[PDB]
Design a protein around this ligand. Structure first.
Ligand SMILES: *[C@@H]1O[C@H](CO)[C@@H](O[C@@H]2O[C@H](CO)[C@@H](O[C@@H]3O[C@H](CO[C@H]4O[C@H](CO)[C@@H](O)[C@H](O[C@H]5O[C@H](CO)[C@@H](O)[C@H](O)[C@@H]5O)[C@@H]4O)[C@@H](O)[C@H](O[C@H]4O[C@H](CO[C@H]5O[C@H](CO)[C@@H](O)[C@H](O)[C@@H]5O)[C@@H](O)[C@H](O)[C@@H]4O)[C@@H]3O)[C@H](O)[C@H]2NC(C)=O)[C@H](O)[C@H]1NC(C)=O
Ligand SMILES: *[C@@H]1O[C@H](CO)[C@@H](O[C@@H]2O[C@H](CO)[C@@H](O[C@@H]3O[C@H](CO[C@H]4O[C@H](CO[C@H]5O[C@H](CO)[C@@H](O)[C@H](O)[C@@H]5O)[C@@H](O)[C@H](O[C@H]5O[C@H](CO[C@H]6O[C@H](CO)[C@@H](O)[C@H](O)[C@@H]6O)[C@@H](O)[C@H](O)[C@@H]5O)[C@@H]4O)[C@@H](O)[C@H](O)[C@@H]3O)[C@H](O)[C@H]2NC(C)=O)[C@H](O)[C@H]1NC(C)=O
Ligand SMILES: *[C@@H]1O[C@H](CO)[C@@H](O[C@@H]2O[C@H](CO)[C@@H](O[C@@H]3O[C@H](CO[C@H]4O[C@H](CO[C@H]5O[C@H](CO)[C@@H](O)[C@H](O)[C@@H]5O)[C@@H](O)[C@H](O)[C@@H]4O)[C@@H](O)[C@H](O[C@H]4O[C@H](CO)[C@@H](O)[C@H](O)[C@@H]4O)[C@@H]3O)[C@H](O)[C@H]2NC(C)=O)[C@H](O)[C@H]1NC(C)=O
Ligand SMILES: *[C@@H]1O[C@H](CO)[C@@H](O[C@@H]2O[C@H](CO)[C@@H](O[C@@H]3O[C@H](CO[C@H]4O[C@H](CO)[C@@H](O)[C@H](O)[C@@H]4O)[C@@H](O)[C@H](O[C@H]4O[C@H](CO)[C@@H](O)[C@H](O)[C@@H]4O)[C@@H]3O)[C@H](O)[C@H]2NC(C)=O)[C@H](O)[C@H]1NC(C)=O
Ligand SMILES: *[C@@H]1O[C@H](CO)[C@@H](O[C@@H]2O[C@H](CO)[C@@H](O[C@@H]3O[C@H](CO[C@H]4O[C@H](CO)[C@@H](O)[C@H](O)[C@@H]4O)[C@@H](O)[C@H](O[C@H]4O[C@H](CO)[C@@H](O)[C@H](O)[C@@H]4O)[C@@H]3O)[C@H](O)[C@H]2NC(C)=O)[C@H](O)[C@H]1NC(C)=O
Ligand SMILES: *[C@@H]1O[C@H](CO)[C@@H](O[C@@H]2O[C@H](CO)[C@@H](O[C@@H]3O[C@H](CO[C@H]4O[C@H](CO[C@H]5O[C@H](CO)[C@@H](O)[C@H](O)[C@@H]5O)[C@@H](O)[C@H](O)[C@@H]4O)[C@@H](O)[C@H](O)[C@@H]3O)[C@H](O)[C@H]2NC(C)=O)[C@H](O)[C@H]1NC(C)=O
Ligand SMILES: *[C@@H]1O[C@H](CO)[C@@H](O[C@@H]2O[C@H](CO)[C@@H](O[C@@H]3O[C@H](CO[C@H]4O[C@H](CO[C@H]5O[C@H](CO)[C@@H](O)[C@H](O)[C@@H]5O)[C@@H](O)[C@H](O)[C@@H]4O)[C@@H](O)[C@H](O)[C@@H]3O)[C@H](O)[C@H]2NC(C)=O)[C@H](O)[C@H]1NC(C)=O
Ligand SMILES: *[C@@H]1O[C@H](CO)[C@@H](O[C@@H]2O[C@H](CO)[C@@H](O[C@@H]3O[C@H](CO)[C@@H](O)[C@H](O[C@H]4O[C@H](CO)[C@@H](O)[C@H](O)[C@@H]4O)[C@@H]3O)[C@H](O)[C@H]2NC(C)=O)[C@H](O)[C@H]1NC(C)=O
Ligand SMILES: *[C@@H]1O[C@H](CO)[C@@H](O[C@@H]2O[C@H](CO)[C@@H](O[C@@H]3O[C@H](CO)[C@@H](O)[C@H](O)[C@@H]3O)[C@H](O)[C@H]2NC(C)=O)[C@H](O)[C@H]1NC(C)=O
Ligand SMILES: *[C@@H]1O[C@H](CO)[C@@H](O[C@@H]2O[C@H](CO)[C@@H](O[C@@H]3O[C@H](CO)[C@@H](O)[C@H](O)[C@@H]3O)[C@H](O)[C@H]2NC(C)=O)[C@H](O)[C@H]1NC(C)=O
Ligand SMILES: *[C@@H]1O[C@H](CO)[C@@H](O)[C@H](O)[C@H]1NC(C)=O
Ligand SMILES: *[C@@H]1O[C@H](CO)[C@@H](O)[C@H](O)[C@H]1NC(C)=O
Lengths: 210, 252, 235, 106, 139, 139
């Protein structure tokens, strides 16, 4: 994409944040009108700004903007937690189509840190029939969205059963994630006890069951 | 939004319509409510059939005064052998028109099943026959000869219809005052397209095996509904108010 | 105002080609344009092309104007101001770079300053252009890992391991229970087999009289087996 | 934004209503044979040019059984028929005992 | 174009023409100056329907044209008013209505309080405005 | 307020409202769009009285509204004129009439030469004033 956005920007609650997008003369915004989009990854997107300053119907006046001789901008006022997602932009004329941007990672800081309700999950009686070892764990509402993967298999080091997978944004606008275990039933049954390691800066209250 | 409808002829007809309008697609079927066996059924063709009728009687005019200025016009003495009035229908042309309807009716009545046509069914002698006016004398033709065949599961001969004539009439079930149509002196011949139809019930067969539709032009207003299905009048309201960031001079 | 819903999950081999559909309702399908935009794994959503249901003039991007031809039929009116319609989009020759999520979205306005931009978006369709073959998933119960149930309410769920391709969701018997249940995102093993988990936030009380059957509906495999949780338990 | 109201005279909007219509037809019976029961001695002449506009984008709903143009049609013909019989010879004397016979059974 | 030619088009297009509707509103070729010209009783059913239709013709035209005169807009086809627009009527924005609703739809959106707008219309533009001469007519 | 609500109040009050009388002057709820809607001869005595009353309705409205058009006052409800007031009409003073006579009394005070005022009214405001463009319309 022959366009650049403001990449990663941060902001605090009850405050404002501004994101820039610009490009060269071919896709320039000197004359071409500009539109903006809200886009939760995977989820269905939402339009916010359609004709430069004018905001889409139903959209709160929380959003503003302006267009200059060389770039266009988006002003989000009174940051609430919902704003923490990805935003894009598209340039166009009346008869042409959209030319989308590259992406803008927005993080809303100043939030209260929530303690995740963590639970280990052991294998079932129907899982041993299949001879496939898998063990997971859950975390939710633990903002900021920072994670740490660690497992103990009978106090022995692990490098194959540890699967560091992608975190996801919860529907409650918080974060969530899960880790998985890929092993063979022989090395699996040779270790009967197991421990769960969740490095969450706070009090030493983590569930640990065999 | 035409200012004026098309050319509508007030064809006083019964059971079968004449000189009407037909859309281009295969025959149309209109019901206020299909499946309410009771409500009648209008039928628009795509191509009209030609039916010609003629009265062979040679009526002489006998004017006899009944008081001053007034003169009753009685049937005189007939000239020539007595011949019954008749209607010709191209049997070839009729068989296909009756077929296209059962094809359109297929998708509206129990899909593929048995569709029969019976003679009128009950009623009075003047409403169960194809009544109409022609040249001034009023014909009543036996329709039982047209609604007797039944097809289901996927120079030239010409049908003829017997017709009797009535001179005493009061139409639209109007019991107020009747009129005497004087006999038309000379020869009679009508040649009008037949474009529409009128059908009725199969009694009250609760679900079951098959469906039959017999003619019954019970009312006269449905005849014009065969000409007015596409029209509707509306009231223009030229006054509209809308907002815009525009105001006239400040003081005045 | 009317949910334009996209029918999808259709995915085939690279180069096979496929047609996607989007069912509309709740608006005059006649004169709003309908757009096609996708986001691939390498980010950067790319607009495909716009098309007008009236007249039929379309302008597709030059990067796809040689291999993508989209067409659309007419609509059946419901009222004077609403109608139901549908749009199609045909593509030819594809590779892994063409994998991603695809959206169809209604054109914003009925005017001349700006219409080509979308407004109301479809539910989206996940396309997989992977050379790997179709595999039915494997259902496994979720063990009763002890959790606080003060008030007589506790969470549970059912686990899914090793499936492919495309993700799917978890439902319940006869619906009813949709609020306050949380199934977790899919996972990609280093082996290439996907997996996922579900965790329900409803009163569990004591296991037995309540319903604990989790319902799963799926892909090429479809569904027939919906397993419950095994009874032996702690506390 | 200080949005002000503005008036527009001639707005294309309509609401379903049924008013009284009237007759139209050009040169028909005229001199050779007139006195038609329907067209009377004079109907307002139809314009030789018919005006039809293909209203675009519009999807108005029709109803042919609840339409009142057919009922206006019905009561017009009845009142039109009775007006064409009212001034003529009444045959009240025709009610006497009639002695009748067949004809040429032979 | 044509009579109601833009009835289905956007409100911006009906704003652009508009006269074609206003012109063909009072007189018609259909009326065609009555009389047969070219039995001697014109009491026929046709004459009754025609005359009662010619009356409601000007009765409906003058009922609406009387409204334009009490708003100071008699001489013109589109006049601006000094009545501010009240947000409770519609929440939509300037370019959101003129390019997305069409008039046919719009008349149904205001028909609830349309009479209330008419009441406020006589006041601000002609009850006060025509009165404001008192100070400015002569000092 | 109300129709003729200020008929008995001073002329200054009728000057203040005035529309309520002008509004309910052409159309009425009483007319109520005729027809029974919801025997087939509408030649009844009632239909004759109604239609002849609907005619004189607009016949009297247009006879007075034609007078407003030939005075340059068609678009507005109260317009000023360029005819000087002649003292032979009334000897009373500015605040003496508007606060002490009421309109009902006033119409009887001018009814003698009221037609003469109307004659001079067409002249100064529209016979000369509309003509004065000759020099000013273009030089
Ligand atoms: C009811 O039915 C009607 C049809 O009767 C439907 O009407 C359609 O509505 C759609 C809605 O989008 C229109 O779609 C586009 O309209 C664009 C209009 O742009 C004009 O206005 C903008 C500002 O509003 C201006 O900026 C444009 O350009 C101006 O400024 C330029 C400089 O930047 C100048 O150079 C220029 O001279 C001008 O001053 C412009 O004035 C239009 O651009 C777009 O065009 C696309 O389709 C075209 C189809 O044919 C159009 O163009 C050709 C010439 O190419 C003309 O001859 C035609 O008359 C027609 O205008 C195509 O040619 C172009 O290449 C583009 O692909 C779209 O047209 C439709 O125009 C409009 N219908 C018709 C008949 O075109 C209506 O939608 C429906 N119902 C409802 C309620 O929606
Ligand atoms: C609907 O109903 C109406 C009812 O009115 C029908 O209209 C009627 O039609 C019939 C048809 O038969 C007409 O009858 C005709 O009468 C005229 C006039 O009468 C003169 O001739 C009579 C002759 O006798 C008749 O009957 C004998 C019986 O054998 C026959 O042989 C004979 O041919 C006749 O048909 C005379 O009796 C009558 O008397 C006076 O003149 C006589 C003249 O000489 C006649 O009789 C002698 C014998 O005496 C014969 O030799 C000689 O040849 C001749 O016949 C005279 O002798 C006698 O003394 C008297 O002076 C009249 O002269 C006949 O000319 C016709 O032949 C026929 O009979 C009705 O008149 C007619 N109705 C009216 C209005 O009068 C109508 O037709 C029907 N609908 C249809 C289908 O149209
Ligand atoms: C239904 O019944 C009616 C009533 O009969 C039929 O009407 C008549 O039918 C006949 C036969 O079809 C027609 O043909 C012939 O018309 C000839 C002309 O007569 C008319 O013009 C005459 C002028 O002069 C002509 O006749 C004189 C002799 O008087 C000649 O010298 C001269 O050269 C002309 O030929 C008028 O004088 C006359 O009044 C007529 O206006 C008739 O001459 C001819 O008569 C023969 O047939 C008669 C029986 O019809 C018979 O009585 C005579 O003796 C003679 O043999 C014949 O009438 C008529 O034109 C026709 N009209 C009228 C008013 O009579 C009608 O045809 C029938 N429908 C059917 C199925 O045919
Ligand atoms: C039973 O049905 C058959 C078949 O339709 C009829 O035979 C047709 O009879 C019709 C009318 O009786 C004839 O129809 C028309 O004739 C027109 C005459 O030409 C011009 O001038 C007249 C008089 O001014 C105008 O009224 C007319 O509009 C024309 O300007 C043709 O020109 C017509 O053809 C085409 O144009 C018209 C214009 O709108 C269209 O409406 C037509 O659909 C068409 O496109 C038309 O042909 C016709 O000629 C006869 N033959 C055929 C095969 O149709 C029987 O008369 C009919 N019987 C009855 C009483 O119903
Ligand atoms: C004008 O034309 C009509 C129609 O032709 C005639 O009406 C017919 O008149 C004849 C004679 O009057 C009727 O025939 C009679 O039938 C009698 C028995 O009828 C019964 O059974 C028959 C069937 O077998 C049924 O149709 C009928 O309804 C009855 O149930 C016979 O008995 C008659 O013959 C002789 O004896 C009787 C009784 O004593 C006498 O009255 C007779 O005069 C005769 O001596 C006779 O055959 C016939 O039914 C009537 N209609 C029909 C169906 O044709 C008019 O009579 C005729 N008028 C003139 C003046 O010609
Ligand atoms: C202009 O403003 C007027 C109000 O002044 C609007 O009038 C409304 O018109 C609508 C439609 O004609 C009315 O809807 C009603 O529909 C009834 C059938 O279903 C209704 O009830 C169902 C269940 O009822 C319960 O809940 C409702 C909630 O209000 C209660 O009122 C009941 O008592 C029950 O507790 C609802 O699920 C359903 O949505 C319907 O409300 C029918 O029987 C009624 O005759 C009526 O048609 C509505 O009632 C009217 N207004 C009010 C507030 O009562 C008008 O639409 C406005 N027009 C525009 C276009 O602006
Ligand atoms: C508008 O202007 C017109 C004039 O153009 C005014 O018309 C006057 O109207 C009044 C009332 O209708 C007329 O009054 C008359 O009354 C008669 C009865 O008594 C009259 O006479 C009595 C004695 O008469 C003698 O003196 C008078 C004085 O003028 C002489 O005319 C007689 O010839 C006698 O010599 C008087 O005491 C008494 O006051 C009356 O005058 C009656 O019989 C008449 O038919 C008439 O109604 C008056 O005559 C009219 N004008 C003139 C000058 O004659 C009209 O009122 C003005 N309207 C307004 C409101 O401005
Ligand atoms: C519905 O239509 C069917 C035919 O599709 C019809 O059945 C046919 O009816 C006719 C007339 O009744 C029958 O024809 C008769 O056949 C008998 C022998 O079976 C002959 O004796 C008859 O001849 C006499 O009558 C003829 C006139 O009808 C005279 O022309 C002749 O000289 C004789 O006097 C006559 O030919 C025919 O057999 C049946 N069957 C078939 C298959 O044709 C049925 O009646 C119709 N129903 C109704 C109520 O319309
Ligand atoms: C059309 O766009 C205009 C703005 O150009 C919208 O008008 C403005 O709408 C916002 C909507 O939030 C109003 O904000 C207010 O926020 C407070 C927060 O407490 C809330 O209580 C109010 O109900 C309202 O939401 C803003 O005041 C308003 N401005 C004015 C005076 O018009 C308009 O709403 C948009 N139309 C729609 C709904 O699409
Ligand atoms: C109605 O009565 C009329 C006669 O008054 C019958 O009309 C005639 O029908 C025959 C059918 O073969 C026609 O024959 C052929 O017509 C074609 C043209 O269509 C012609 O090219 C052939 O040379 C041959 O004449 C005949 O023309 C036709 N006459 C006219 C002028 O219409 C008619 O058939 C009767 N209706 C029924 C039920 O058949
Ligand atoms: C609009 O007018 C209504 C009725 O007086 C009132 O309730 C509403 O608050 C007004 N809105 C504004 C602020 O224009
Ligand atoms: C008023 O006009 C009348 C009639 O022309 C005249 O007699 C009278 O003197 C005038 N008064 C003045 C000076 O305005």
């Amino acid at each position: 994409s022959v366009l650049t956005q403001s990449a990663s920007v941060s902001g605090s609650l009850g405050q404002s944040v501004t994101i820039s997008c610009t490009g060269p003369n071919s896709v320039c915004c000197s004359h071409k009108s500009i539109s903006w989009y809200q886009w939760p990854p995977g989820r269905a997107p939402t339009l916010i700004i359609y004709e430069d300053n004018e905001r889409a119907p139903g959209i709160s006046p929380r959003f503003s903007g302006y267009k200059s001789y060389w770039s266009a901008y988006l002003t989000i006022s009174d940051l609430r937690p919902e704003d923490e997602t990805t935003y894009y932009c598209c340039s166009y004329t009346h008869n042409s189509g959209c030319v989308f941007g590259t992406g803008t990672k927005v993080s809303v800081l100043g939030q209260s840190k929530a303690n995740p309700s963590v639970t280990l999950f052991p294998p079932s009686s129907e899982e041993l029939q299949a001879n496939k070892a898998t063990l997971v764990c859950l975390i939710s509402d633990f903002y900021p969205g920072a994670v740490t993967v660690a497992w103990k298999a009978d106090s022995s080091p692990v490098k194959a059963g540890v699967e560091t997978t992608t975190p996801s944004k919860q529907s409650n606008n918080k974060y969530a994630a899960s880790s998985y275990l890929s092993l063979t039933p022989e090395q699996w049954k040779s270790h009967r006890s197991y421990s769960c390691q969740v490095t969450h800066e706070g009090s030493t209250v983590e569930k640990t069951v065999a | 939004t035409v200012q004026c409808t098309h050319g509508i002829k007030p064809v006083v007809s019964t059971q079968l319509l004449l000189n009407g309008s037909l859309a281009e697609e295969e025959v149309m079927i209109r019901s206020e409510n299909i499946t309410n066996n009771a409500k009648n059924i209008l039928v628009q063709f795509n191509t009209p059939v030609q039916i010609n009728c003629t009265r062979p009687n040679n009526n002489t005019r006998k004017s006899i005064r009944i008081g001053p200025g007034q003169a009753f016009y009685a049937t005189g003495d007939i000239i020539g052998d007595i011949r019954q009035a008749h209607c010709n229908v191209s049997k070839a042309t009729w068989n296909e028109t009756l077929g296209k309807v059962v094809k359109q009716l297929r998708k509206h009545f129990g899909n593929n099943t048995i569709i029969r046509f019976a003679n009128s069914s009950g009623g009075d002698l003047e409403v169960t026959t194809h009544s109409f006016n022609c040249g001034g004398e009023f014909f009543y033709c036996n329709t039982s000869g047209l609604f007797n065949s039944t097809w289901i599961s996927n120079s030239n001969d010409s049908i003829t219809l017997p017709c009797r004539i009535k001179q005493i009439i009061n139409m639209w079930q109007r019991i107020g005052q009747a009129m005497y149509a004087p006999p038309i002196q000379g020869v009679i011949r009508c040649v009008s397209n037949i474009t529409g139809l009128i059908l009725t019930r199969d009694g009250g067969s609760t679900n079951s095996t098959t469906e039959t539709f017999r003619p019954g032009g019970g009312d006269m207003r449905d005849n014009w509904r065969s000409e007015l299905y596409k029209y509707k009048v509306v009231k223009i309201e030229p006054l509209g108010v809308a907002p815009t960031r525009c105001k006239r001079r400040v003081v005045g | 105002e009317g949910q334009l819903v996209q029918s999808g999950a259709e995915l085939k081999k690279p180069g096979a080609s496929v047609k996607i559909s989007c069912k509309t309702s709740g608006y005059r399908f006649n004169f709003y344009h309908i757009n096609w935009i996708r986001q691939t794994a390498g980010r950067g959503p790319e607009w495909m092309g716009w098309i007008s249901p009236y007249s039929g003039d379309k302008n597709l991007a030059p990067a796809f104007q040689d291999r993508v031809i989209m067409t659309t039929d007419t609509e059946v009116p419901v009222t004077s101001f609403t109608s139901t319609g549908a749009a199609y989009m045909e593509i030819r020759n594809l590779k892994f770079d063409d994998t991603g999520t695809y959206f169809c979205a209604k054109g914003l306005l009925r005017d001349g300053s700006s219409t080509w931009l979308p407004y109301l978006w479809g539910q989206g369709t996940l396309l997989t252009v992977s050379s790997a073959s179709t595999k039915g998933p494997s259902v496994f119960p979720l063990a009763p890992s002890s959790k606080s149930t003060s008030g007589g309410t506790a969470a549970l769920g059912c686990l899914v391991k090793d499936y492919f391709p495309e993700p799917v969701t978890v439902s319940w018997n006869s619906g009813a229970l949709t609020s306050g249940v949380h199934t977790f995102p899919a996972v990609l093993q280093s082996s290439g087999l996907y997996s996922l988990s579900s965790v329900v936030t409803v009163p569990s009380s004591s296991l037995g009289t309540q319903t604990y059957i989790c319902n799963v509906n799926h892909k090429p495999s479809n569904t027939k087996v919906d397993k419950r949780v095994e009874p032996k338990s702690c506390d | 934004e200080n949005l002000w109201v503005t008036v527009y005279y001639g707005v294309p909007v309509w609401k379903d209503a049924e008013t009284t219509l009237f007759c139209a037809s050009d040169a028909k019976a005229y001199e050779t044979e007139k006195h038609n029961v329907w067209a009377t001695h004079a109907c307002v002449p139809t314009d030789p040019n018919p005006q039809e506009i293909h209203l675009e984008n519009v999807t108005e709903e029709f109803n042919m059984w609840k339409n009142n143009m057919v009922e206006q049609m019905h009561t017009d013909i009845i009142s039109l028929w009775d007006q064409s019989l009212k001034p003529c010879v009444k045959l009240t004397p025709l009610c006497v005992t009639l002695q009748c016979t067949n004809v040429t059974n032979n | 174009l044509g009579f109601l030619g833009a009835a289905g088009s956007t409100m911006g297009a009906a704003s652009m023409t508009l006269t074609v509707q206003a012109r063909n509103l009072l007189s018609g070729i259909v009326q065609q100056q009555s009389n047969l010209l070219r039995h001697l009783l014109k009491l026929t059913v046709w004459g009754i329907k025609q005359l009662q239709a010619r009356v409601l013709a000007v009765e409906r035209y003058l009922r609406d044209q009387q409204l334009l005169g009490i708003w100071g807009c008699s001489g013109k086809l589109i006049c601006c008013t000094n009545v501010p627009w009240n947000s409770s009527w519609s929440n939509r924005n300037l370019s959101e209505i003129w390019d997305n609703m069409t008039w046919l739809q719009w008349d149904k959106e205001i028909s609830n309080y349309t009479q209330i707008i008419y009441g406020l219309l006589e006041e601000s533009q002609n009850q006060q405005e025509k009165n404001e001469q008192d100070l400015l007519a002569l000092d």
